[PDB]
Amino acid sequence: GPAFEFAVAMMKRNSSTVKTEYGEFTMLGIYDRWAVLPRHAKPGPTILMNDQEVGVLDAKELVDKDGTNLELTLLKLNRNEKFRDIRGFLAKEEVEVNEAVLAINTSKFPNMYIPVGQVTEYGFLNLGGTPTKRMLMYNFPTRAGQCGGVLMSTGKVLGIHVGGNGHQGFSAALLKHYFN
């Protein structure tokens, strides 16, 4: 319940629906004009944010010290409004919680929430055939179209949904130091 209430308020304030040439995704704005998308959203020079064209000034595909994929892309938007700073909700390291909610906000899944329960630091995962690190895992039957969904618990934004299959889902940990 507390996770859900936190999630609903967070999505209302910081999330948006974005369309790239590769699909429609839930997007979370972090601070200033910087947001995050799963790496496979592959944002080009402009994106559609809440149905309006927005230019992308910069986009960084995140990888660790050894070049291993982290499945997240950070983008700086060409817009005047600034995102409410939610960096204080981002942990310094991978979070594990007993009750988390996954929040999705797109045309296909309009403001929908999923109780995914326990989140464990899974870590290494060959994801879609690509070695990936800092994965968080939860047991729930996720679906295509849910990528970009925001994984949260009471007072915490843990990561962004990037994959899954069968009845497991995985998020890339959204760490504080990715934004300084």
Ligand SMILES: *[C@@H](CC(C)=O)[C@H](C[C@@H]1CCNC1=O)NC(=O)[C@H](CC(C)C)NC(=O)[C@H](CNC(=O)C(C)(C)C)NC(=O)OCc1ccccc1
């Ligand atoms: C969101 C992105 C889109 C286009 O909607 C999906 C979410 C997942 C679909 C299945 N359930 C979901 O929650 N993400 C993908 O489809 C994801 C894409 C990558 C990183 C670009 N690929 C996976 O989610 C996932 C990767 N592999 C594994 O999880 C295992 C267990 C096999 C290691 N699996 C998947 O998409 O199906 C298998 C697969 C398809 C194609 C290539 C490789 C594996």
